[PDB]
């Protein structure tokens, strides 16, 4: 019944700002973090960051500081990233992944990814 | 900080087989919360374990996390065909999560 349901494939230019979502159901959007992970062929994942929907807070990997942000909108229990300055090192498929941290942490259910291409106006 | 893991294990049904994840700084630690989560075809991923040891509601049991001398560790005991996929661990360094390179696991 848990379902983490991310939007559907983007195309945009080069310099430009794209905004993914990530909308939750089947469970308390509040009691789970929001991971969103970068997978780009031949490089595995990489983190990107977390955030706290329960007042929003975020931690992100240094490297995505001024690429990323995070934000949650409670209402309708959706998670977003936006990324900005596009280049064609962010053509990737993004996915968000929640987790439980308390007592313990764990990953379990993931989005089923959103494909980002970074492509030029001919 | 930089996370290895083997590139490729094969294992056949039935067998156990351990997956394993190095961090280069030094031993991986309870401090790293060591997790695993595994990749499918048509990116299909689910999260096994985390916090080390401890499994996500629902996986199975048969998939077991610890820590193996300076490394966490990954057990899959009497793997099944359907266990065939990429495994990723991850580890945490006091403010951010490292992702391994992935381990594709062939069962015969």
């Known amino acids: 019944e848990v379902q983490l349901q991310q939007s559907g494939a983007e195309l945009v230019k080069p310099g430009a700002s794209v905004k993914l979502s990530c909308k939750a159901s089947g469970y308390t959007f509040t009691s789970y973090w929001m991971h969103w992970v970068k997978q780009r062929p031949g490089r595995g994942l990489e983190w990107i960051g977390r955030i706290d929907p329960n007042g929003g807070g975020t931690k992100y990997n240094e490297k995505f500081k001024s690429k990323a942000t995070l934000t949650v909108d409670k209402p309708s229990s959706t998670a977003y990233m936006q990324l900005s300055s596009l280049t064609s090192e962010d053509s990737a498929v993004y996915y968000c992944?929640?987790?439980?941290?308390?007592?313990?942490?764990?990953?379990?259910?993931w989005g089923q990814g959103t494909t980002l291409t970074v492509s030029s106006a001919a | 900080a930089v996370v290895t893991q083997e590139s490729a294990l094969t294992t056949s049904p039935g067998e156990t087989v351990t997956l394993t994840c190095r961090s280069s700084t030094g031993a991986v630690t309870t401090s790293n919360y060591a997790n695993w989560v595994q990749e499918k075809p048509d990116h299909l991923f689910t999260g096994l374990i985390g916090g080390t040891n401890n499994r996500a509601p629902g996986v199975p049991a048969r998939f077991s996390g610890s820590l193996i001398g300076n490394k966490a560790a990954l057990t899959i005991t009497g793997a099944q065909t359907e266990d065939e996929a990429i495994y990723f661990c991850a580890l945490w360094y006091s403010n951010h999560l490292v992702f391994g390179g992935g381990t594709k696991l062939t069962v015969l």
């Open positions: 992944a929640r987790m439980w941290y308390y007592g313990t942490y764990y990953f379990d259910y």
